Amino acid sequence: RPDFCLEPPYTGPCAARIIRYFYNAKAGLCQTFVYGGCRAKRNNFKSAEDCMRTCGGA
C-alpha cells in the first residue's frame, strides 16, 4: 500500500473541527480524527470506506 498510509494523522494549521478518517497501521484499520480544515496530508479521507479501499492492509 502507499507509504502515506503509514503517516500519523495531520490536523494542520487551520482551526476547524472536521471529522476525517486515517489509516492506523498499528491497528490495521481506519480511525476517526479531527482535521483543522486545511493542508490535509494524503492519509485523510471523508469516509471509512474510502480510507480502507486506499490503505487497507498497509
Binding site: 490536523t11 494542520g12 494549521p13 487551520c14 482551526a15 476547524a16 479531527v34 483543522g36
Partner: protein, 97 residues
C-alpha cells in the same frame, strides 16, 4: 481534547503586518490580518467565528478565525481572514442573490 460546552471569549490586540511577519514571514498574504500572541489563542472549533472591534461604538467584523500555531500556542500570532479586503466581495454576492 473536547470543546467547552459554553461559549468562550478573549480580548486580544491587532498586530501590524510587519510584526506578524516577524514570526510567519511570507505565509502572511494580503487578505489576512493577525491578532493575539498575547496569552490567548484561537483553536480547533473556533474557525469561521468572529474577530470584532468597535467602530464608533458598534462591534464590527474585522477578522474571521482562520489559522495559526498548530498547537494553538498563546505566544504566536493568530491569523484571520481580513474582512476589509473581502467585504466588497461580500456586498457583491449579497446584491446578486
Amino acid at each position: 481534547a473536547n470543546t467547552p460546552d459554553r461559549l468562550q471569549q478573549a480580548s486580544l490586540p491587532l498586530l501590524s503586518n510587519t510584526n506578524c511577519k516577524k514570526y510567519w514571514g511570507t505565509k502572511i498574504k494580503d487578505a489576512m490580518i493577525c491578532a493575539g500572541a498575547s496569552g490567548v489563542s484561537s483553536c480547533m472549533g473556533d474557525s469561521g467565528g468572529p474577530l470584532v472591534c468597535k467602530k464608533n461604538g458598534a462591534w464590527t467584523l474585522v477578522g474571521i478565525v482562520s489559522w495559526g500555531s498548530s498547537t494553538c500556542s498563546t505566544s504566536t500570532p493568530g491569523v484571520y481572514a481580513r474582512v476589509t479586503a473581502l467585504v466588497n466581495w461580500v456586498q457583491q454576492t449579497l446584491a446578486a442573490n
